């Protein structure tokens with residue numbers, strides 16, 4: 001019983017975190033096999049308008065740090081906005097792949113400073129391709145991940161905080177989420193929306209755990225999106241399908257839960273669900289399927 | 297920027313989790329040096345009223361499981377409600393101690409099934425000595441911990457879920473938090489209260505991160521506890537003292553923040569703080585001092 005914002009165990013990722021120094025700038029890097037991944041803005045100084053291709057550095061200009069042992073850069077390259085440092089092969093490398101996630105998907109974040117992990121928490125790729133993270137200076141290079149069976153699927157590396165306090169970064173192959181670029185120019189987070197399918201999944205979690213917000217109506221998929229728009233991401237057929245298992249375990253049809261969400265949006269909560277006074281949207285259907293016990 | 301429910305990295309604890317089987321019952325155990333700690337109710341069958349001292353088992357009756365390698369019990373004893381299994385010495389043992397925490401203190405929980413970690417989350421020892429955890433069957437033996445410098449301070453082992461859905465367990469030396477006992481008899485969680493000093497710490501976090509709820513009044517410590525009682529744990533001088541650093545970093549005196557909390561309790565929120573629509577009370581002052589960057 002209960003329901004918590006739950007991160008994957010961070011152990012297989014702690015063994016990969018390292019320090020990357022270049023000049024005066026130090027940030028975090030990720031050590032997988034003999035390659036070290038980190039944000040390319042680690043070669044930067046001033047930054048107002050860097051031409052990153054601008055070839056002026058040597059291998060021996062990058063100091064890598066794996067605890068106390070110092071690593072030796074033997075080759076370097078740049079892939080998109082990520083720097084890849086070949087070094088003379090981490091024994092603690094797990095099974096891992098790099099994946100680029102869709103907005104609305106969740107992951108765990110291992111926040112790190114000077115290559116030393118500090119904490120772990122959950123968050124979602126918002127529909128506007130920012131993440132509401134928790135990051136201070138020197139956190140760049142912290143990564144976000146999911147763990148499936150025994151495989152670490154890396155999906156985020158932190159690069160940047162925006163003026164509204166949310167965060168932007170890239171997949172592990174260096175492609176930013178959103179329209180953001182790694183330079184010190186004005187860039188704002190776009191208008192955000194609420195992740196409907198995830199709110200719905202969370203209502204099913206509330207039901208699985210034994211809880212008032214239900215009602216007797218239904219709605220059409222179209223009529224539901226009409227109301228949602230007024231407050232929320234349109235809900236697709238594929239969303240309905242994805243909510244399938246949760247609907248069968250609970251015997252509440254997807255479109256009945258939508259009618260419930262409709263009412264909750266129209267009348268407010270009048271006073272909490274799973275310990276929350278607002279509609280949470282950072283649990284996926286997969287995340288909810290914690291109520292069942294999946295380990296790794 | 298940002299503020300999240302943040303767990304310690306769970307890596308130093310994942311290396312300690314094992315399986316403990318006795319008869320038909322399997323649960324989780326903790327492997328430190330050559331000793332394996334687990335809930336003593338693992339020797340039980342029926343349970344309506346066990347006399348645990350009742351000596352009838354052999355060493356070879358306990359099957360320990362460290363991944364795939366099977367461990368051999370060479371000695372056993374019982375300390376309070378925890379069983380200690382001597383086995384033929386975990387290479388992955390960290391620096392660790394056992395501490396028994398005061399109510400209102402927070403810790404991370406590594407939820408585990410069949411000795412395999414499943415997830416990590418934060419929670420607090422409630423004033424009624426329960427924890428609002430997230431636990432399914434087979435979670436018994438999962439532990440809760442804090443990490444200071446490089447030392448894992450274990451403070452909780454899970455034993456039991458109560459009918460209201462909250463959870464009860466022991467320190468790692470087997471002493472239950474609260475008046476609970478490990479047998480299948482009627483036992484209810486007592487009336488709970490809100491952890492005032494932690495609400496206050498969270499308001500300071502809101503201020504550190506740049507946020508409306510402040511006002512110009514003050515209050516006496518006595519006058520504050522008067523109002524709190526009507527809604528909250530009395531706030532002591534020692535609490536005020538503990539809030540010292542946060543008050544100096546922000547330039548808002550403790551008793552000014554209390555006046556703010558007074559107003560917030562009297563008038564509600566009128567519509568969120570740090571992404572929450574209710575007054576959060578599972579961050580300590582220490583936890584808030586994430587806004588500063590402490591790693592381990």
Ligand SMILES: O=C1CN(CCOc2cc(Cl)cc(-c3cc(-c4c[nH]c(=O)[nH]c4=O)cn(-c4cccnc4)c3=O)c2)CCN1
Nearest residue numbers: 025026041135136137138139140160161182183184186187
């Ligand atoms: O309008 C706007 C205005 N912004 C201007 C600021 O531009 C950038 C661009 C880029 Cl590529 C990176 C950063 C950035 C660098 C560093 C950093 C620098 N040096 C070190 O040695 N260690 C470090 O960690 C840290 N953090 C940061 C701070 C707090 C939380 N999380 C990330 C950055 O955000 C900042 C752009 C967005 N849109």
Ligand SMILES: O=C1CN(CCOc2cc(Cl)cc(-c3cc(-c4c[nH]c(=O)[nH]c4=O)cn(-c4cccnc4)c3=O)c2)CCN1
Nearest residue numbers: 321322337431432433434435436456457478479480482483
């Ligand atoms: O009024 C009341 C009524 N209660 C009656 C129930 O009593 C107990 C007593 C004791 Cl000592 C332990 C449990 C208990 C055992 C097991 C368990 C059993 N066998 C296995 O093989 N694996 C397992 O995990 C699991 N969980 C449990 C379930 C869900 C979440 N987290 C913990 C228990 O809670 C239950 C007492 C409280 N107050």
